[PDB]
Amino acid sequence: GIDPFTGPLEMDSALSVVQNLEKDLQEIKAAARDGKLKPLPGETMEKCTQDLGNSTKAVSSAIAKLLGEIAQGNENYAGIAARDVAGGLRSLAQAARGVAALTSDPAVQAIVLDTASDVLDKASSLIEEAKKASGHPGDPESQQRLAQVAKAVTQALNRCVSCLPGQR
């Protein structure tokens, strides 16, 4: 017993963060549906959508760090990058939910949150796969699937910024 696998536990911890992120927006989904949200127009939609785009590019850079090399047993960057994605996903979700709160149209509100939720959804399995890959001294299949799910996160991000209300 007594396993010293306490090195790359950052990924599992990051998974928890993302799983808290989905449940964060879970409350927000119901809230937006009800008509709660945070409709404070202090942050203008231009800024929220701008931040959303930056958040997108941020975590897109973060996933590239996860898809870089392989974590064999213990690795620090693997954990740091797992923290970096989590931060980007928070920023993503926070900007998206702001957009929904600023708009009064009961359609785009759900769409902006849904896409953000789809991001973290795929990002979850991104971390899940990475968790498994960290226990593999260079696994072929794990990295193949990891790359696929990484891009799925990117697609969701790109879809979120696309579904933003800009119909003028």
Curated annotation (Swiss-Prot):
Residues annotated with Phosphothreonine modification: 103
Protein name: Talin-1
Taxonomic path: Eukaryota, Metazoa, Chordata, Craniata, Vertebrata
Residues the record lists as Phosphoserine modifications: 162
Function: High molecular weight cytoskeletal protein concentrated at regions of cell-matrix and cell-cell contacts. Involved in connections of major cytoskeletal structures to the plasma membrane. With KANK1 co-organize the assembly of cortical microtubule stabilizing complexes (CMSCs) positioned to control microtubule-actin crosstalk at focal adhesions (FAs) rims.
Location(s), subcellular: Cell projection, Ruffle membrane; Cytoplasm, Cytoskeleton; Cell surface; Cell junction, Focal adhesion
The protein's assembly and partners: Part of a complex composed of THSD1, PTK2/FAK1, TLN1 and VCL. Interacts with THSD1; this promotes interaction with PTK2/FAK1 and VCL. Interacts with NRAP and LAYN. Interacts with SYNM. Interacts with ITGB1; the interaction is prevented by competitive binding of ITGB1BP1. Binds with high affinity to VCL and with low affinity to integrins. Interacts with APBB1IP; this inhibits VCL binding. Interacts with PTK2/FAK1. Interacts with PIP5K1C. Interacts with F-actin. Interacts with SVEP1.
Region (Helical bundle R5): 7-167
Domain topic, free-text comment: Consists of an N-terminal FERM domain linked via a short unstructured region to a large flexible C-terminal rod which contains 13 amphipathic helical bundles (R1-R13). The rod begins with a five-helix bundle (R1) followed by three four-helix bundles (R2-R4). These are followed by a series of eight five-helix bundles (R5-R7 and R9-R13) in which the N- and C-termini are positioned at opposite ends of the bundle, creating a linear chain. The four-helix bundle R8 does not disrupt the chain because it is inserted into a loop in the R7 five-helix bundle.
Phosphotyrosine PTM sites in chain numbering: 77
Species this chain originates from: Mus musculus
